[PDB]
A paper describes a structure:
ChAs retain epitopes from both [name] and [name], and can elicit functional immune responses against both antigens.
We determined the atomic structures of ChAs with VR2 P1.16 inserted into position 151, 294, or 309, all of which generated [name]-dependent SBA titres. These structures were solved using molecular replacement to resolutions of 2.9 Å for fHbpV1.4:PorA151/P1.16, 3.7 Å for fHbpV1.1:PorA294/P1.16 and 2.6 Å for fHbpV1.4:PorA309/P1.16. In each structure VR2 P1.16 adopts a β-turn conformation that extends away from the [name] scaffold. We demonstrate that integration of a VR2 loop does not alter the overall architecture of [name] and that the VR2 loop folds into a conformation recognised by a bactericidal mAb. SBA titres were detected with antisera raised against fHbpV1.1:PorA294/P1.16 when alum was used as the adjuvant, and with antisera raised against fHbpV1.1:PorA151/P1.16 (a low level of SBA from a single mouse), or fHbpV1.1:PorA309/P1.16 when MPLA was the adjuvant.
Residue numbers in the entry: 78 to 181, 185 to 308, 308A, 308B, 308C, 308D, 308E, 308F, ...
The structure:
Amino acid sequence: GAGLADALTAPLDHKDKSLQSLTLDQSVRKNEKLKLAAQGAEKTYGNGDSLNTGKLKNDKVSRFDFIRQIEVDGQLITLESGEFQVYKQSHSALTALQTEQVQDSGKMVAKRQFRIGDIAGEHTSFDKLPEGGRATYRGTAFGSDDASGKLTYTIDFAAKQGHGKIEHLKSPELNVDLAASDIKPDKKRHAVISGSVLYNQAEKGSYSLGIFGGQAQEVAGSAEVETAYYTKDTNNNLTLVPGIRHIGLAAKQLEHHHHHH
């Protein structure tokens, strides 16, 4: 697939597959500039700009190089550097950022972080949900340095309650269970599910999924798993501090098309 450079250069096309535009909001805030570069050329994005996801492959992670910067007195200052990840589905898509370089004034230090960017798509109205039956969504859960997570979720529309499970991630602590939670309409009446995660029947963080698709075809959100990492003091004093591991979640129902299997 060589159309990943077309996502940064070619305009929006109505014939492109599935979700063709992603509004970059949380990925780049305020006056910041998010420069994406991959394959051939590059494109700079501002807050609210559109990402031409239509020319990216569905159900796969596209990887760009991102430089998050800001202008100070007419000159761009590199705030963050790393890899920008985009997972595209048919009615929803989400982005993630792997921090590789931060500031620490004029230089850049090497720090590795990972956060979830935007989670956008055709939000399903809570007032337009099915009434009865259980939908099975299967897809990907991807975290820092691991895109092979297998996400499985199921929603009961008669009880308005869904639950899930994450498997096959490299770190066995991240293979956590998505506890049962109710379907609730958010501020914009969109159908969202928020709950906790369970490892060995113990709370280890939270998770938030959004229902996307005109007929609730897909679910897309993120999970925050509670972990603990080491901090090396200025005198080599280790401290076991708590941290959060962010996991991108994106699943879809099994499709049945008119003219192909």
